[PDB]
Each structure stands twice: as structure tokens, then as C-alpha cells.
Design a protein around this ligand. Structure first.
Ligand SMILES: [Mg+2]
Ligand SMILES: [Mg+2]
Ligand SMILES: [Mg+2]
Ligand SMILES: [Mg+2]
Ligand SMILES: [Mg+2]
Ligand SMILES: [Mg+2]
Ligand SMILES: [Mg+2]
Ligand SMILES: [Mg+2]
Ligand SMILES: [Mg+2]
Ligand SMILES: [Mg+2]
Ligand SMILES: [Mg+2]
Ligand SMILES: [Mg+2]
Lengths: 100, 66, 142, 144, 75, 185, 57, 62, 141
RNA sequence: GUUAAUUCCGAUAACGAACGAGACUCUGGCAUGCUAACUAGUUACGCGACCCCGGUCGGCGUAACUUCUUAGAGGGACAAGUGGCGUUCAGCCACCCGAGAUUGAGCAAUAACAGGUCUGUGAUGCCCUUAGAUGUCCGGGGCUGCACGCGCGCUACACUGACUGGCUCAGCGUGUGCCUACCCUACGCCGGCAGGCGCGGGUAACCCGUUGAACCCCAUUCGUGAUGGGGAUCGGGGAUUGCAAUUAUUCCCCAUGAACGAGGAAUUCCCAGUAAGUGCGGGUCAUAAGCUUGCGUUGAUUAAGUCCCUGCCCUUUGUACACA
């Protein structure tokens, strides 16, 4: 009943589009839904020397990967959850479904 | 150093010469005017254009400009 | 009856002070302890100064409880120094005559502007090839 | 009480080592080799001696007790770890050495290393660092 | 070259002069006491607190690093 | 509320500035009085906002140098407070007034530069900064490797500079610079 | 190499583009290393526009 | 010789090998008709008082 | 009317140490005088009755933030460990001294080993703590 | 002339342009206006504990909200306004109102070097070895060896300090691995100690963790002594990891107690939350930072200028150089 779907994505625009589409689908079906919360962004930062060898001035790179996680709470039968989640999904967003 | 570049100055000149009627001495009014008229993707550049537009409008209303 | 609850946040380098104002006597305390004993106690006047300038008459009608989190000791005490004044100004502007709000703001600003507006200064990022933001390691000629 | 009393011993020779008595007791004892600040404080705490007194303020009836405790630490409720020669090679008993047997036991261990021709003994014989330090840029002062 | 031979404990003459001239100073601090009496700083602090216990010296402030004492008023 | 004062003892008023060339560069009277010499700062943003900073705050900031004292403001504020207590006990008059007298006396009026040397009169701001730095250097030099605490090594330096009896290090360096400037003109 | 570079350049231009650049570096035209560059049109080397306006291989 | 106070009325510009000084037009506060030039060390403004020990020697102008 | 937070802690800890001194039912360990409070310390504590003060401070910390175990106390009482040539780093205090203090305060009815771990201060200890604070407030004013 | 800029104005046989810079992206600022939140909270309500109606709780549950927290769309600052300098153009200074009136970084170019990488490679031409191997595997040594010189760094030379107790505040992150055999830790016992023994939490805004860090603040001891500064050298003992420590992996205790009294010639980096002080994450990891990459705390003096020195760019000039 109290279903909870977790969406992790690398692109902010795609993730916001997916969450907006899901909540609009919930609005169309007239289901009680919690607001889209935003977990703090995870920035995997790696710093490496530009030069393959050790010569030259000490110059370092800054390669960072940003991951955003948003979760939505809904009150609906699991069949409704599967129906809603099976459609309108961007390939770049990882989806997790939790019953509890 | 706060110097307007060629893009800002040239765009401001042509905008004023094309919409001299719709522009005035109020920075905020023509800021929205130039937003509606010309497609400037960056708002900072938009403010730069609007600022130079107002300065040129003051110059025009006071006297000639080359 | 009426709930004159006023929330206000004052910011420092990193510390933040959320002061809550309601109806009550002239009791002022932060983190559940009074202002007179706040280590480092050397800068006690930096916390009593908002009370001193405006007088206990203004603070008699309002009780303030504040929560402090983040930053260092000097950051927190300056955060609460700003937040106490901001909370009183917000309370006066929202529930009593604004002439009192205008006069206290003028007095606070003419004394020190930091009472109201937060300083936007932050720590600068460090860069490679040096020990600090601007500092660079020792150059080695020959 | 601040006035200096009579019979003030300015210098006390304890374990054939001179000690200046115008300083604090816990650090005047440190003048003896083989006992430091940590050892002196423990000894002066086992004895009923107030710390604030000086080495010339107290009497000689208790200094004999102190030195006996120092030379016999295990008999006055001091554990083995607080000694400098725990589990000695020769006699195999935990004991404290103070400024007389300290060097004798030191050369005894070195002489043992010399006899067995161990790596540590060879380093001591050659005057080179024994704990594997880099001598390329260090130790130049001692070796010419 | 130059070394100071400070007195660890009071001599009779030093104790007498401490009881006589020290209370009449405009400022009373252990640093100045040691400087003008050729005694240890610790001895000066012990003497000043003992004289404070006697009640002949007033204080203005107390601090871990330096404690400042003031003389009695003439009134 | 009126009557803005120092830590707990001394009021901003009853201060006399004999030199009228430092009226706008000495900030002690009725507009820059603070209970503590500690402020958020922002006086190093523009050029001539340094003068508006209270002179006690400038003294407190300039006191902490020589590495080990760097970034220690809560220590020098106590040091300045103790120095104010000592001078008040000694002279029996206004500690801020004696600080002003010390600064206006220690401040050099002439100096030498390269344009051999040529004599040039210093700016009022430059004079104040040089005096507020020389007297700290002299007090620090006196306190170093000595039993006497710096909490009074700054204070006795203050009264010596205020009296101008040629005993303060700042006064001695001031006269040396004036002598050099006088010769090279 | 010259025929190949001009041929691919013309193919890219006739396909429809705003700017093209190709660099061929190696031991062509002699054992000594040389780099040949063929450029035309507007080219952008700076900013994030290079991430979504020019593609490099 | 008396020490005199003068009021700055105009700034000429930087001077010195490294540009470490600023030659400044200054005027005395008792007879404002008489005005001279002098090199001043340190940051300066327009409309401030300078203490001159010697009011006769003149700094070189550029 | 007066609690611990209504009075200064600097003399409150000394007053509670005096309260423990006049109580004398803590059963202090045998090695109190011959122990170093942490690996980052050099000598034994200057105060010979430091155990009463440490117990007083531990009770104060437990009252302010309950549920702190031995590891939490070591983190609280840790400090710089000057390794000599190498620059200092933070190091926790000795586990045994904090654990013995907790057991000593457990023997008396002042703290309790509550659920979900940690140490919880009992109401009787709370009554003793703030009535000591009340005495401090009365003595000061 | 002006600008950080061949950035612009302005004279002008030039006019229009393009790359670069600029622009742009990320980052910090502030919005009681919008969206939202039991993996974050706030305000009130009810119990529980405590003190003389009131006060405290990171003690327990629930009626509202997102101010505090997290993250999304937008807004917002532009030399916008005033007074001055400036052909009255570009631009510069001061100021009021104002979160800011110069936040930092990334990409960064027609071109050159015979600068480094053939030891990053299943990227590679040629040469060489190719079975008594320059391929591979195993045992051990070495990469640390010390009469000397030089460079990058740590510790300090002490009273603004050291030592001993008390009080008190953060954000950067990471954390159970494909082969892979190795994670981050709350809590209770043993012990001074590193560390050992047990059940638990965590694939993470959920657990460590409200990251009770240091500096600093408060109170005693030291008293100008190479002294309780300083921790080099060195002995003995106790533990962890690893198949294995000897040339002592690392950690802990006792003890021994060197130079160094602020450092010559010369020389390094820097201008605002900057340097410096201080501590904390990641890389290396079975064991590990005295390096580096970042973060947090305290936090200043000088100065809004120049070609004097050093370089480096433009112009003029000279050329018998042009693989320069
Ligand atoms: Mg060693
Ligand atoms: Mg090639
Ligand atoms: Mg080639
Ligand atoms: Mg471009
Ligand atoms: Mg530890
Ligand atoms: Mg660019
Ligand atoms: Mg192949
Ligand atoms: Mg092989
Ligand atoms: Mg030494
Ligand atoms: Mg050794
Ligand atoms: Mg150099
Ligand atoms: Mg010629």
C-alpha cells in the first residue's frame, strides 16, 4: 500500500522530467502522493596528474561525477504501481521499488 | 575592469536604432523590452545590453551620437 | 491567545543562529543557557551589545530562544549577535508599530552594520601547486 | 612559611650524583640518570610528600625512604611496566637502574652484541645508526 | 655574560622589605616584584597571594597568565 | 543607550587630540567607540577605509605577529585590556588618551627615500601606521626573553612614548628617521 | 594524404556543417615528423559549447 | 625653525624609481595664497593636513 | 528554579567534585596515582584527586547528552598527540579511566546502563546535580 | 586615451568580419516569495524526569509549517543612480540605496620545442634476446648503504610559551570490492597502554555521527636556566598487520637527553575571509602521510603604484641567417 519508489539519475533535467511525469500520472489517477524530496547530491571527486609521466609542472585535474536521488511515496495497490512505473521512464534513471 | 565588448555595444546600437520608440531612461523597463525583442540566451549579457542601451539613450536624448 | 512567534536566522562565515521570539518577559538565552556565561566569555559584550544599545525596555516584552549550529566560536557569537537584532526587528515590524522598527534599525546601523546584514565572506578554495588558495610552494631555481 | 628555614641543603648528593635543591622536588630528582619526570612523580606520590615543597624544604628522614623505593620499586606497589630494564637478559628480573648501573648495563648489552657479532653490535662498533635511518644526508656532524 | 641569581625563598631582610615597600607601589604584579627584588617569579606569586591572604593588597582583575594587584587607597 | 565605553572601565570621551593633522585618521571619539577591539573587519576591502577602523582595533591586529601569534585575536584583546589596566594604574588618567599621545609622539614627521637619500614628509595615514607598528615592535622586542610579561611590556612602552623621554624604542626609531631625513635634504 | 584529407573535407562540407578541422601528424613526407592541418569555416576551441557544438575524434 | 601644517589641494602623481612616492600640490593653512609642491611617502588623499618641518625646500616636479 | 545550565560550568564541576569528596562512596581504582590519562599526555595529572573531578565532568557530560559509552568519552577527552618532529594529530583518551569512571558512577545510583547502549543518568543523580547547581547559584548570589 | 585584454573609444584608405579574450559551465553568497519533504527539521500540544507558576531535556509520542536543512525552476547587478575627472566618447574615482559595486576554477591557440613519456598499454616502425632467455615462476639481496654538496618539507630555538585539569564550537568526504583473497564503526568486558574478546548498525541525509577535531577560552605549576623549550641518538620491555620485520613496517611505556640564543651571501610566495597558525577527509594501504589533493577554525600589517631590478610582449632599426 505505502509504496516508495527511488529514482537515481546523473542528469538533473532528465530526473526532474521523470519525477514530474510520475507525479502528473498520480494526479491523473487521483492518488495521495508525497512531495518529491531531494537527497543531497553525491559528488564523486577524483584528482589526478594530467601528465602520464612525472615531468612538467605539477598540474592536477578535477573529475567529478554528480548523482542525484529523489524518492516518492504513494498510496496505491502494487498493480497500480507496476502500471505507472512500466511506462514513461527515461533510460538514464535507475529505478528502485520498495514496499515497506 | 568593466568594459563592454563589441558584441554588447554593437547589439545595443542596432537595438536602439530599431526600437528607439520603445526605449527610455529606465533600466528595468527596457531590460524586459529587449528580452521580448531580441533572443539573448544569457541573462548577464542581457543586463549588459540593457545597461549600455540606457546609457546610449541618455546620450541620444541629450544630444547627437555617431 | 495570539501566537506572535517570529523566526529569524543570522549567518556568519559558516555558523547560523535561528532566534525564536514570542510573548514573555525579558529573558534572553541561547542553547538553554543565559548570555552572561558563553565561552569564550571575553567577547561577552559582543553578545550583550544588541541589548545594551536598545535598552532592556524593548526586550522586556519579548523573550528570545535561539539555536546555534555550524561554524566556530567567533562565527557562532557573531551569528547570534546578528540574529538577536534581526529577530527583534522582525518582531517589531510584524506585530507592533513600525516607527519603533525604524528607530532601532537606524541606531543599530549607525553603530555597526553587521547587526543586520550578514557578511557574505566565505573561505576560498585551495588550488593545486600550492599550500593555500593564493600561496604557492617554494620555487627551486637551479 | 615562605622564609627559607635553617639547615637548607642547597646541593644533595644522591646515588653519587649531585642534585640542586633550589628547584622542585619532582624535577630535582630528574637530575639523576635513569629516572625522569614520570618516574620521579610516581616515586614522590608513593611517598607521602607534598609536591609544592622544595628539595631543601623537606628533611633527610624521608629521602632515605625515597631512594630505597627508587632502588626497590616493585616492593612499594609499582608494576613492572614502569621500569627501564624489564625482563633483563642476564638475571631475568624486572628492576630499575639509576645513574650507576645504567651505563654498566648499557655497555653490558653492547658487549653482548659485540661478542655475538650481531648487526646491532656492528653498527654500534662502527658508529652508524642502528635503527635503519638514512645516513646519506644525516649524521654528518658526528662523523667528521 | 649576565645572569640573575633570584632567591627561591625569602631571607629575613627580603621578607622585611617586601612587607615595607611592596604594598606602597602604584602597581603590584609578580613580574615587577621579581624584577626589583631579585626573586623567582613563582616566589613573587606566592608572596603576593600570601600578602593577599593577609589582606593588605587589593586586586583589579584575575587571569591565568597575569594577575594584577593594586595598592590600598589613602582614604 | 548612551555612554559607549571600553571593556568595562573607560569611556570614549575625555580624550584630547593635540595634533589636528590626524583628526580624520584617529577614530576614538563618538563614532567608532566599541566595547571590544574585535570587529568583523572588512576594512581592507577599499583603500582609505583603513583609517575609519578604530585605532584600538588596529593596535590589536598589529600586535599579533612573528608566526606563533598569527591568527590569535582572542589573546591580544586580553593583552591590550591588561595593558590598559596597567597604564590606568600608573598614570591615573585616560588609557585611550595616553594611547593617542603615544601614537602622535611616536609618529615620524619626516623620512628618507630613493628618488643617497632625499627627505620626504610622510602622509598622516602613513605616519599613524608606522607608529602603530614600531611601538608594537619595540614592546615585542622588550618582552622577548624576559620575565616581564608583554601585558605590561606594551603598557610601559605606551607611557614611555606618550611622555617622550627618549626611552621608548618607537621614539628612538622616530628620532633616528627624523635625523636621517634632516641630514639628507 | 593530401587527396584523402581534401576528399573527407569536401564530403563534410557538402554534408552540411559550420566548420571543419583535421590534423594528420606522423612520419609522412619523409622520416622527419610533420603535421598537416586542413581548416575551414568557423571553429570554437573554448567554453562548454565545445561539448555540444563540435565533436572530436 | 617652526614646524608648520599644510593642507593638500591637488595631487600631481607618482614619483620615484619604483614610483614609491607621490608629489603633491599643498598649501599652508595660515596664508593659503602661498602654495608649493612636495613629495609625500605613503598613501595620500586630497584635503588632508601634513606636518612639514621645512617649508622652503621644493621637491622636483615631473 | 535553577538548573545546571542556569549556572557557570567552570565552578560547577569543582563543586560537584567537592560533593563527591565529602561523599566518599565512589570506590576509586587502586592505580589512580600511577596512571596516565591518555596516550597523548606526558605526565600524571597535577591534581592528585583528579578522579573526583573527572567523575564530576563525566556526570555533567552524561546529563547534557546521555547515551555516551566508553568510546564517546574517549573522544570527548581526547586531544593533540604531539609526536615530536611529526605534527600533532587528534587521539582519544584512555578507555580504562573513562570505563572505571562509568562503573564508579554506576555503583552509586546516579547513572544507569540504559537500553540501545550508552550510559543514562538516573533521576537521583539529576537531583544531586542540579541541587549542587542550586548551591553554586546561592553561593555566588 | 582606456581596459585584466588587438577590450573598447577615437583619428585614420579603409569597411565589414571570424578565432582568441570576452561570452559560457560549475562553484559561494540571498529569497520568511514558489515546489516539496518520518532517510532533515522547526513551532506548538500531551506525558516522563529534575529544580525553586516558571526553567531544561539530542527524554518519549502527535497538530500545523518549511524560517533553520537538503535540491529544482526562476529572480537578482547592470557601472543601474548621484557628484567629479575625462574630446564630454571610451573609461576611471568617491558615495547613497543595496546579499554582493573586482568570488574562485574548467575549457582554454594561427604556431614552435627534435622538452617527457618505447617503464601506461593487446598503440606502434626498426634493432636485439628467444631455451645456458633480456619471456615467465621461486628463494635472497638491493632500490635506505655514507668522509661530502644541493633541493622540496617537518620540528623547534620559548613567558603572546611549555605542562596539568575544565568549558566549548565545523564542513569537505569515505565506508562489505568482477578476478579481489582486504570495509567504516557504535556498545559492554580485560588492561596504563597500543591492543584483545562478544553479540549489534551501515551498500548509507537512515549507522558510526548532532562527525563532542584542534587552535583558541578558563584555572594552577614552571621563572630567563639550553630550564618542565627542544625530541635527535640510543637500551629494555609490551601489542597490531602480514607466509615472513633482520637493515629495528607501524603503535605504546620507562629511560638515555644531541644540536638549535631568530641564522651570512643569496633567495621564495602573497595582496581579503588572503597569508600565517591549527586540525580533519581522499590518493598511496595487509601494515601507513614527515608528500600531495581538498575542507574546516582563528584570522591580520602593508598597499589601489612602477619599470628601479628580473623577465616577457609590441613597435623601430640591422642582417652576408632562412634545415633560420
Ligand atoms: Mg627511534
Ligand atoms: Mg608523427
Ligand atoms: Mg619523426
Ligand atoms: Mg569565443
Ligand atoms: Mg586514539
Ligand atoms: Mg575564455
Ligand atoms: Mg596486437
Ligand atoms: Mg618469469
Ligand atoms: Mg634544545
Ligand atoms: Mg636507541
Ligand atoms: Mg629564489
Ligand atoms: Mg650593421
Amino acid at each position: 500500500h505505502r509504496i516508495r519508489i527511488t529514482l537515481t539519475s546523473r542528469n538533473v533535467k532528465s530526473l526532474e522530467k521523470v519525477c514530474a511525469d510520475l507525479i502528473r500520472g498520480a494526479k491523473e489517477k487521483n492518488l495521495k502522493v508525497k512531495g518529491p524530496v531531494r537527497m543531497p547530491t553525491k559528488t564523486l571527486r577524483i584528482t589526478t596528474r594530467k601528465t602520464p609521466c612525472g615531468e612538467g609542472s605539477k598540474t592536477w585535474d578535477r573529475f567529478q561525477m554528480r548523482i542525484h536521488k529523489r524518492l516518492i511515496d504513494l498510496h496505491s495497490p502494487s498493480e497500480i504501481v507496476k502500471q505507472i512505473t512500466s511506462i514513461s521512464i527515461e533510460p538514464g534513471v535507475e529505478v528502485e521499488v520498495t514496499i515497506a | 575592469g568593466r568594459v563592454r565588448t563589441k558584441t554588447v555595444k554593437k547589439a545595443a546600437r542596432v537595438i536602439i536604432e530599431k526600437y528607439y520608440t520603445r526605449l527610455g531612461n529606465d533600466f528595468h523597463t527596457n531590460k524586459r523590452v529587449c528580452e521580448e525583442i531580441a533572443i539573448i540566451p544569457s541573462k548577464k549579457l542581457r543586463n549588459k545590453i540593457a545597461g549600455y542601451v540606457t546609457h546610449l539613450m541618455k546620450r541620444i536624448q541629450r544630444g547627437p551620437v555617431r | 491567545g495570539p501566537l506572535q512567534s517570529v523566526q529569524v536566522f543570522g549567518r556568519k562565515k559558516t555558523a547560523t543562529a535561528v532566534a525564536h521570539c514570542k510573548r514573555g518577559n525579558g529573558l534572553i538565552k541561547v542553547n538553554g543557557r543565559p548570555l552572561e556565561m558563553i565561552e569564550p566569555r571575553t567577547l561577552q559584550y559582543k553578545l550583550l551589545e544588541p541589548v545594551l544599545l536598545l535598552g532592556k525596555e524593548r526586550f522586556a516584552g519579548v523573550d528570545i530562544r535561539v539555536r546555534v549550529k555550524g561554524g566556530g566560536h567567533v562565527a557562532q557569537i557573531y551569528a547570534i549577535r546578528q540574529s538577536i537584532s534581526k529577530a527583534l526587528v522582525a518582531y517589531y515590524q510584524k506585530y507592533v508599530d513600525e516607527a519603533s522598527k525604524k528607530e532601532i534599525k537606524d541606531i543599530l546601523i549607525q553603530y555597526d552594520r553587521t547587526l543586520l546584514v550578514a557578511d557574505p565572506r566565505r573561505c576560498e578554495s585551495k588550488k593545486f601547486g600550492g599550500p593555500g588558495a593564493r600561496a604557492r610552494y617554494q620555487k627551486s631555481y637551479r | 612559611s615562605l622564609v627559607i628555614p635553617e639547615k637548607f641543603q642547597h646541593i644533595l648528593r644522591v646515588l653519587n650524583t649531585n642534585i640542586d635543591g633550589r628547584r622542585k622536588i619532582a624535577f630535582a630528582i630528574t637530575a639523576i640518570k635513569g629516572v625522569g619526570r614520570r618516574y620521579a612523580h610516581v616515586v614522590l606520590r608513593k611517598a607521602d610528600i607534598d609536591l609544592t615543597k622544595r628539595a631543601g624544604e623537606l628533611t633527610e628522614d624521608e629521602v632515605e625512604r625515597v631512594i630505597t623505593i627508587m632502588q626497590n620499586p616493585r616492593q612499594y606497589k609499582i608494576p613492572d611496566w614502569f621500569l627501564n630494564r624489564q625482563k633483563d637478559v642476564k638475571d631475568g628480573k624486572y628492576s630499575q637502574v639509576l645513574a650507576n648501573g645504567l651505563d654498566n648495563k648499557l655497555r653490558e648489552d653492547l658487549e653482548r652484541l659485540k661478542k655475538i657479532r650481531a648487526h646491532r653490535g656492528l653498527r654500534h662498533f662502527w658508529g652508524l645508526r642502528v635503527r635503519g635511518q638514512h645516513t646519506k644526508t644525516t649524521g654528518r656532524r658526528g662523523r667528521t | 655574560r649576565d645572569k640573575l641569581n633570584n632567591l627561591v625563598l625569602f631571607d629575613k631582610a627580603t621578607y622585611d622589605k617586601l612587607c615595607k615597600e611592596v604594598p606602597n607601589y602604584k602597581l603590584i604584579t609578580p613580574a615587577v616584584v621579581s624584577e626589583r627584588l631579585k626573586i623567582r617569579g613563582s616566589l613573587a606569586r606566592a608572596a603576593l597571594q600570601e600578602l593577599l591572604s593577609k589582606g593588605l593588597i587589593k586586586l583589579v582583575s584575575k587571569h591565568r597568565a597575569q594577575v594584577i594587584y593594586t595598592r590600598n587607597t589613602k582614604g | 543607550t548612551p555612554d559607549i565605553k571600553l571593556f568595562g572601565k573607560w569611556s570614549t570621551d575625555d580624550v584630547q587630540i593635540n595634533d589636528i593633522s590626524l583628526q580624520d585618521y584617529i577614530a576614538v571619539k563618538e563614532k567608532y567607540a566599541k566595547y571590544l577591539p574585535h570587529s568583523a573587519g572588512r576594512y581592507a576591502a577599499k583603500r582609505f577605509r583603513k583609517a575609519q577602523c578604530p585605532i584600538v582595533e588596529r593596535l590589536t591586529n598589529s600586535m599579533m605577529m612573528h608566526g606563533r601569534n598569527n591568527g590569535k585575536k582572542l589573546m591580544t584583546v586580553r593583552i591590550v585590556k591588561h595593558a590598559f589596566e596597567i597604564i590606568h594604574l600608573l598614570t591615573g588618567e585616560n588609557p585611550l588618551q595616553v594611547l593617542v599621545n603615544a601614537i602622535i609622539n611616536s609618529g615620524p614627521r619626516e623620512d628618507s627615500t630613493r628618488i643617497r637619500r632625499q627627505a620626504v614628509d610622510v602622509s598622516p595615514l602613513r605616519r599613524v601606521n608606522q607608529a602603530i607598528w614600531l611601538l608594537c615592535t619595540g614592546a615585542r622586542e622588550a618582552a622577548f626573553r624576559n620575565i616581564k610579561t608583554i601585558a605590561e611590556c606594551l603598557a610601559d612602552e605606551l607611557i614611555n612614548a606618550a611622555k617622550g623621554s627618549s626611552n621608548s624604542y618607537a621614539i628612538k626609531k622616530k628620532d633616528e628617521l627624523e635625523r636621517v631625513a634632516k641630514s639628507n635634504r | 594524404v593530401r587527396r584523402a584529407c581534401y576528399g573527407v573535407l569536401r564530403f563534410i562540407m557538402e554534408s552540411g556543417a559550420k566548420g571543419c578541422e583535421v590534423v594528420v601528424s606522423g612520419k609522412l613526407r619523409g622520416q622527419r615528423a610533420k603535421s598537416m592541418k586542413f581548416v575551414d569555416g568557423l571553429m570554437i576551441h573554448s567554453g562548454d559549447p565545445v561539448n555540444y557544438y563540435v565533436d572530436t575524434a | 625653525q617652526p614646524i608648520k601644517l599644510a593642507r593638500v589641494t591637488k595631487v600631481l602623481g607618482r614619483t620615484g624609481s619604483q614610483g614609491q612616492c607621490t608629489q603633491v600640490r599643498v598649501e599652508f593653512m595660515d596664508d593659503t595664497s602661498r602654495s608649493i609642491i612636495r613629495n609625500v611617502k605613503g598613501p595620500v588623499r586630497e584635503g588632508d593636513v601634513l606636518t612639514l618641518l621645512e617649508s622652503e625646500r621644493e621637491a622636483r616636479r615631473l | 528554579g535553577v538548573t545546571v545550565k542556569d549556572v557557570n560550568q567552570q565552578e560547577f564541576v569543582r563543586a560537584l567534585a567537592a560533593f563527591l569528596k565529602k561523599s566518599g562512596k565512589l570506590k576509586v581504582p587502586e592505580w589512580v596515582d600511577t596512571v596516565k590519562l591518555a596516550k597523548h599526555k606526558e605526565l600524571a595529572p597535577y591534581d592528585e584527586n583528579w578522579f573526583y573531578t573527572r567523575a564530576a565532568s563525566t556526570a555533567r557530560h552524561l546529563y547534557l547528552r546521555g547515551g555516551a559509552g566508553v568510546g564517546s568519552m574517549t573522544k570527548i577527552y581526547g586531544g593533540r598527540q604531539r609526536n615530536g618532529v611529526m605534527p600533532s594529530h587528534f587521539s582519544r583518551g584512555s578507555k580504562s579511566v573513562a570505563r572505571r569512571v562509568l562503573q564508579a558512577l554506576e555503583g552509586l545510583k546516579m547513572v544507569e546502563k540504559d537500553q540501545d547502549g550508552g550510559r543514562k543518568l538516573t533521576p537521583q543523580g539529576q537531583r544531586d546535580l542540579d541541587r549542587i547547581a542550586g548551591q553554586v547559584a546561592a553561593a555566588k548570589k
